[PDB]
């Protein structure tokens, strides 16, 4: 009589040995199907084309942000120095120490 499906294969000594020899060979070859971690000079005419496209892209993404953005959309835009120079122009100051750390000096 005809059987409808192949029976479930039994695990025997030769099957186990073949499996273990495959595992041994792949360990020796270091072949491992592992999941790998995903991370994280042009010319002058090409540079001019890139600069023009960068400016156009900046303006376009500004206008699209104005359309879809929940808040107000701003327009798209360390040497040794005293911090009192880094402040804004007004009679007072609040911080005195120079910008560079001792480890940076």
């Amino acid at each position: 009589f005809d059987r409808t499906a192949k029976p479930v294969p039994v695990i025997t000594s030769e099957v186990t040995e073949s499996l273990e020899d495959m595992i041994r060979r792949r360990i020796q070859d270091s072949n491992f199907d592992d999941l790998q971690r995903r991370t994280l000079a042009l010319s002058e005419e090409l540079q001019k084309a890139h600069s023009e496209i960068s400016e156009l892209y900046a303006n376009l993404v500004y206008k699209l942000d104005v359309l879809s953005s929940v808040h107000f959309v701003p327009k798209p835009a360390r040497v040794e120095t005293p911090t009192i120079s880094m402040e804004d122009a007004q009679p007072l100051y609040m911080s005195n120490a120079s910008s560079l750390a001792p480890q940076e000096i």
Partner: protein, 59 residues
């Protein structure tokens, strides 16, 4: 399924066999029921009817 066999040993020799219905529905003998003796469990591709007849082809 009943009346195909007379005992669970007879069923257990024929387990895994193709069977079919006079309608044409194909199925498989799966296991022998404990009680009563000749009965067995079968799985088909569709629901079958109590008017159906199950046949197993041998030579």
């Amino acid at each position: 399924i009943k009346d195909m066999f007379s005992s669970a040993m007879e069923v257990a020799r024929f387990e895994g066999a193709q069977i079919k219905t006079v309608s044409g529905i194909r199925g498989e003998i799966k296991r022998a029921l404990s009680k009563p003796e000749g009965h067995y469990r079968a799985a088909f591709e569709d629901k079958i009817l109590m008017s159906d007849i199950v046949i197993l082809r041998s030579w």
